Amino acid sequence: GGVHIEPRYRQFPQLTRSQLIQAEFFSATMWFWILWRFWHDSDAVLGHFPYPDPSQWTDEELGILPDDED
Template sequence: MVATRLVPLLRTAVLPSLRRGLHTSSSRSSGAVWTYRTAPAAPSKTVTRRAEIVSSIMWWWILYHFMTDYEHITGEFAYPDPSLWTDEELGIPPDDED
């Protein structure tokens, strides 16, 4: 008798609410506003301002280190002068060798 009254109760009250609340995947548009053949909405001023601040800090960091730690790009040691190299160091045989 309890089972005969419990099954309709589960069908009408509990199961639809469980189906509504269970989602195993996110929505297709990921919560963003859907636009089709129109330009997307412009970002807010705070987002634009934050992006400019972050990019300014990034470029300051890059340019500052180009000026102060330029050895990362040019190398740590002075480039040797090729005019001071001998023929033996370059692997050139002497002129009198036949």
């Protein structure tokens, strides 16, 4: 199916530029996809809706009377 590549016996194996450009292209498209999604949809990681502070609410809205009425 492929081309003839010979053994080497203690030196680096023969590499085709095809597999090199293919691996680089797929790694590059992985990183491009990650960056593109982070730019276009960043709310999936950092969140979009703020978390309220429970102590910052006032007793007016929480149904609290000054400890004397009821």
